[PDB]
Protein backbone atom coordinates (compact mmCIF):
# COMPACT_ATOMS: atom_id res chain seq x y z
CA UNK A 1 0.00 0.00 0.00
CA UNK A 2 1.23 3.53 -0.94
CA UNK A 3 1.61 6.06 1.89
CA UNK A 4 -0.93 8.47 0.31
CA UNK A 5 -3.52 5.59 0.00
CA UNK A 6 -3.12 4.99 3.79
CA UNK A 7 -3.97 8.74 4.32
CA UNK A 8 -6.94 8.44 1.94
CA UNK A 9 -8.58 5.46 3.69
CA UNK A 10 -8.61 7.25 7.11
CA UNK A 11 -10.43 10.36 5.76
CA UNK A 12 -13.04 11.26 8.43
CA UNK A 13 -16.74 10.72 7.61
CA UNK A 14 -18.93 13.78 6.85
CA UNK A 15 -20.68 14.99 10.03
CA UNK A 16 -24.09 16.74 10.11
CA UNK A 17 -24.63 19.88 12.25
CA UNK A 18 -28.20 18.94 13.31
CA UNK A 19 -29.29 22.39 12.09
CA UNK A 20 -33.10 22.90 11.91
CA UNK A 21 -33.45 25.12 8.78
CA UNK A 22 -37.25 25.60 9.50
CA UNK A 23 -36.33 27.85 12.52
CA UNK A 24 -34.84 31.24 11.29
CA UNK A 25 -31.09 32.04 11.20
CA UNK A 26 -28.98 34.17 13.54
CA UNK A 27 -25.22 34.67 13.95
CA UNK A 28 -25.28 33.40 17.63
CA UNK A 29 -27.27 30.32 16.58
CA UNK A 30 -24.88 29.52 13.69
CA UNK A 31 -21.78 30.15 15.89
CA UNK A 32 -23.16 27.95 18.74
CA UNK A 33 -24.01 25.08 16.27
CA UNK A 34 -20.53 25.39 14.62
CA UNK A 35 -18.78 25.16 18.02
CA UNK A 36 -20.75 21.96 18.92
CA UNK A 37 -20.01 20.60 15.41
CA UNK A 38 -16.34 21.60 15.92
CA UNK A 39 -15.97 19.46 19.06
CA UNK A 40 -17.26 16.42 17.11
CA UNK A 41 -14.85 17.13 14.22
CA UNK A 42 -11.98 17.27 16.76
CA UNK A 43 -12.95 13.97 18.51
CA UNK A 44 -12.87 12.45 14.95
CA UNK A 45 -9.50 14.28 14.31
CA UNK A 46 -7.89 12.34 17.22
CA UNK A 47 -9.03 9.00 15.73
CA UNK A 48 -7.70 10.17 12.32
CA UNK A 49 -4.24 11.29 13.67
CA UNK A 50 -3.78 7.95 15.52
CA UNK A 51 -4.14 6.14 12.17
CA UNK A 52 -1.53 8.36 10.32
CA UNK A 53 1.57 6.13 9.75
CA UNK A 54 4.27 7.28 12.19
CA UNK A 55 2.07 9.45 14.49
CA UNK A 56 1.59 6.80 17.27
CA UNK A 57 5.40 6.28 17.37
CA UNK A 58 5.85 9.86 18.73
CA UNK A 59 5.78 10.39 22.51
CA UNK A 60 2.16 10.59 23.80
CA UNK A 61 2.91 14.22 24.97
CA UNK A 62 3.95 15.12 21.35
CA UNK A 63 0.74 13.54 20.00
CA UNK A 64 -1.29 15.82 22.40
CA UNK A 65 0.89 18.87 21.60
CA UNK A 66 0.58 18.51 17.77
CA UNK A 67 -3.23 18.06 17.89
CA UNK A 68 -3.59 21.08 20.22
CA UNK A 69 -1.46 23.37 18.02
CA UNK A 70 -2.93 22.26 14.66
CA UNK A 71 -6.65 21.69 15.50
CA UNK A 72 -7.87 24.94 13.73
CA UNK A 73 -5.39 24.46 10.83
CA UNK A 74 -6.74 20.93 10.22
CA UNK A 75 -10.38 22.13 10.45
CA UNK A 76 -10.03 25.20 8.19
CA UNK A 77 -8.02 23.08 5.63
CA UNK A 78 -10.53 20.17 5.66
CA UNK A 79 -13.40 22.73 5.38
CA UNK A 80 -11.66 24.58 2.53
CA UNK A 81 -11.28 21.28 0.63
CA UNK A 82 -14.89 20.27 1.34
CA UNK A 83 -16.00 23.74 0.18
CA UNK A 84 -13.82 23.62 -3.02
CA UNK A 85 -15.31 20.14 -3.88
CA UNK A 86 -19.01 21.15 -3.36
CA UNK A 87 -18.70 24.73 -4.88
CA UNK A 88 -18.61 26.14 -7.74
CA UNK A 89 -19.68 29.44 -5.99
CA UNK A 90 -17.89 29.41 -3.46
CA UNK A 91 -19.61 28.90 -0.05
CA UNK A 92 -18.53 27.33 3.28
CA UNK A 93 -19.79 23.74 3.51
CA UNK A 94 -19.43 23.07 7.29
CA UNK A 95 -22.05 20.30 7.06
CA UNK A 96 -24.57 19.09 4.37
CA UNK A 97 -27.35 20.60 6.62
CA UNK A 98 -25.34 23.85 7.28
CA UNK A 99 -23.79 25.70 4.34
CA UNK A 100 -22.95 29.41 4.82
CA UNK A 101 -24.81 30.62 1.71
CA UNK A 102 -25.06 34.18 0.18
CA UNK A 103 -27.88 35.28 2.57
CA UNK A 104 -26.16 33.76 5.71
CA UNK A 105 -23.00 35.77 4.94
CA UNK A 106 -25.09 39.02 5.27
CA UNK A 107 -25.83 38.13 8.98
CA UNK A 108 -23.91 40.46 11.41
CA UNK A 109 -20.22 39.45 11.90
CA UNK A 110 -20.60 36.33 9.61
CA UNK A 111 -18.44 37.55 6.64
CA UNK A 112 -15.49 38.65 8.88
CA UNK A 113 -15.45 35.12 10.42
CA UNK A 114 -15.90 33.35 7.02
CA UNK A 115 -13.46 35.36 4.77
CA UNK A 116 -10.19 33.69 5.95
CA UNK A 117 -11.61 30.19 5.35
CA UNK A 118 -13.04 31.37 1.99
CA UNK A 119 -9.41 32.36 1.07
CA UNK A 120 -8.29 28.70 1.75
CA UNK A 121 -11.14 27.34 -0.39
CA UNK A 122 -10.49 29.91 -3.23
CA UNK A 123 -6.72 29.06 -3.17
CA UNK A 124 -7.25 25.25 -3.46
CA UNK A 125 -9.56 26.05 -6.42
CA UNK A 126 -7.11 28.56 -8.08
CA UNK A 127 -4.20 26.08 -7.64
CA UNK A 128 -6.47 23.15 -8.80
CA UNK A 129 -5.20 21.06 -5.83
CA UNK A 130 -5.71 17.30 -6.19
CA UNK A 131 -7.06 14.74 -3.72
CA UNK A 132 -3.57 13.27 -3.12
CA UNK A 133 -1.82 16.67 -2.79
CA UNK A 134 -4.57 17.75 -0.27
CA UNK A 135 -4.16 14.52 1.80
CA UNK A 136 -0.38 15.10 2.02
CA UNK A 137 -0.86 18.82 2.80
CA UNK A 138 -3.45 18.03 5.55
CA UNK A 139 -1.09 15.60 7.38
CA UNK A 140 1.67 18.28 6.98
CA UNK A 141 -0.66 20.78 8.69
CA UNK A 142 -0.80 18.44 11.71
CA UNK A 143 3.06 18.69 11.68
CA UNK A 144 3.15 22.55 11.09
CA UNK A 145 3.95 23.72 14.72
CA UNK A 146 6.11 22.46 17.52
CA UNK A 147 6.86 23.93 21.01
CA UNK A 148 9.68 26.57 21.47
CA UNK A 149 12.05 23.83 22.79
CA UNK A 150 10.75 21.23 20.35
CA UNK A 151 9.22 17.82 21.00
CA UNK A 152 10.22 14.83 23.14
CA UNK A 153 10.55 12.71 19.92
CA UNK A 154 11.96 15.62 17.79
CA UNK A 155 14.37 13.42 15.73
CA UNK A 156 11.52 10.99 14.82
CA UNK A 157 9.12 13.96 14.19
CA UNK A 158 11.59 15.51 11.71
CA UNK A 159 11.89 12.09 9.94
CA UNK A 160 8.05 11.66 9.81
CA UNK A 161 7.67 15.26 8.53
CA UNK A 162 10.35 14.74 5.78
CA UNK A 163 8.53 11.52 4.71
CA UNK A 164 5.28 13.57 4.20
CA UNK A 165 7.14 16.45 2.43
CA UNK A 166 8.44 13.71 0.00
CA UNK A 167 4.89 12.29 -0.18
CA UNK A 168 3.61 15.75 -1.29
CA UNK A 169 6.46 15.74 -3.88
CA UNK A 170 5.23 12.36 -5.27
CA UNK A 171 1.61 13.72 -5.63
CA UNK A 172 2.85 16.90 -7.49
CA UNK A 173 4.88 14.68 -9.96
CA UNK A 174 1.72 12.51 -10.69
CA UNK A 175 0.51 15.47 -12.86
CA UNK A 176 3.92 16.19 -14.62
CA UNK A 177 4.81 18.74 -15.76
CA UNK A 178 7.80 19.27 -16.22
CA UNK A 179 10.15 19.73 -14.30
CA UNK A 180 10.71 23.42 -13.31
CA UNK A 181 6.84 23.35 -13.31
CA UNK A 182 7.19 20.78 -10.47
CA UNK A 183 9.43 23.24 -8.51
CA UNK A 184 6.82 25.98 -9.26
CA UNK A 185 3.99 23.73 -7.93
CA UNK A 186 5.90 22.61 -4.78
CA UNK A 187 6.63 26.32 -4.16
CA UNK A 188 2.92 27.26 -4.58
CA UNK A 189 1.48 24.42 -2.38
CA UNK A 190 4.06 24.91 0.42
CA UNK A 191 3.39 28.70 0.18
CA UNK A 192 -0.37 27.99 0.77
CA UNK A 193 0.67 25.65 3.69
CA UNK A 194 2.75 28.53 5.18
CA UNK A 195 -0.24 30.93 4.76
CA UNK A 196 -2.41 28.60 6.96
CA UNK A 197 -0.53 29.99 10.08
CA UNK A 198 -1.89 33.49 9.21
CA UNK A 199 -5.34 32.12 8.37
CA UNK A 200 -5.37 30.31 11.78
CA UNK A 201 -4.05 33.37 13.70
CA UNK A 202 -7.09 35.32 12.41
CA UNK A 203 -9.47 32.45 13.21
CA UNK A 204 -8.09 32.05 16.77
CA UNK A 205 -8.55 35.82 17.53
CA UNK A 206 -12.37 35.43 17.13
CA UNK A 207 -12.37 31.95 18.76
CA UNK A 208 -10.33 33.09 21.86
CA UNK A 209 -12.47 36.28 22.28
CA UNK A 210 -15.87 34.41 22.22
CA UNK A 211 -14.48 31.72 24.55
CA UNK A 212 -13.05 34.18 27.14
CA UNK A 213 -16.04 36.60 27.14
CA UNK A 214 -18.76 34.68 29.09
CA UNK A 215 -21.23 37.61 28.69
CA UNK A 216 -21.56 36.56 24.95
CA UNK A 217 -23.22 33.26 26.04
CA UNK A 218 -21.22 31.44 23.32
CA UNK A 219 -20.82 27.79 24.34
CA UNK A 220 -17.89 25.52 23.46
CA UNK A 221 -18.08 21.72 23.96
CA UNK A 222 -15.58 20.14 26.40
CA UNK A 223 -13.24 18.98 23.56
CA UNK A 224 -12.79 22.56 22.34
CA UNK A 225 -12.93 24.19 25.82
CA UNK A 226 -9.92 21.94 26.74
CA UNK A 227 -7.98 22.75 23.51
CA UNK A 228 -8.60 26.54 23.93
CA UNK A 229 -7.72 26.47 27.67
CA UNK A 230 -4.40 24.70 26.84
CA UNK A 231 -3.54 26.94 23.85
CA UNK A 232 -4.30 30.45 25.24
CA UNK A 233 -1.24 30.35 27.73
CA UNK A 234 1.09 28.80 25.08
CA UNK A 235 0.40 31.80 22.80
CA UNK A 236 0.87 34.41 25.61
CA UNK A 237 4.28 32.82 26.62
CA UNK A 238 5.58 32.50 23.02
CA UNK A 239 5.57 28.71 23.41
CA UNK A 240 5.05 28.02 19.66
CA UNK A 241 7.44 27.47 16.73
CA UNK A 242 5.49 27.77 13.47
CA UNK A 243 7.42 25.68 10.90
CA UNK A 244 7.80 27.46 7.53
CA UNK A 245 8.77 26.22 4.08
CA UNK A 246 9.62 29.75 2.77
CA UNK A 247 11.08 32.79 4.65
Amino acid sequence: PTLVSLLEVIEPEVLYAGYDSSVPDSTWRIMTTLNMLGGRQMIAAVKWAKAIPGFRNLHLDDQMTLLQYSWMSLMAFALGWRSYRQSSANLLCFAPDLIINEQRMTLPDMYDQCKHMLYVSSELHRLQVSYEEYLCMKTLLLLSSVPKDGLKSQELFDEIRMTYIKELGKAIVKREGNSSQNWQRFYQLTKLLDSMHEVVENLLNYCFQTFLDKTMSIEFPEMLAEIITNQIPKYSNGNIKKLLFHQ
Binding site: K47, Q63, Q68, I227
Partner: peptide
Protein backbone atom coordinates in the same frame (compact mmCIF):
# COMPACT_ATOMS: atom_id res chain seq x y z
CA UNK B 1 -5.00 18.99 32.78
CA UNK B 2 -6.01 17.99 29.18
CA UNK B 3 -7.95 14.93 30.45
CA UNK B 4 -10.26 14.35 27.43
CA UNK B 5 -7.57 14.55 24.72
CA UNK B 6 -5.28 12.26 26.85
CA UNK B 7 -8.18 9.73 27.17
CA UNK B 8 -8.96 9.76 23.42
CA UNK B 9 -5.31 9.17 22.48
CA UNK B 10 -4.77 6.47 25.18
CA UNK B 11 -8.03 4.49 24.71
CA UNK B 12 -8.45 1.77 22.02
CA UNK B 13 -10.42 2.81 18.89
Amino acid sequence: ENALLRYLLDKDD
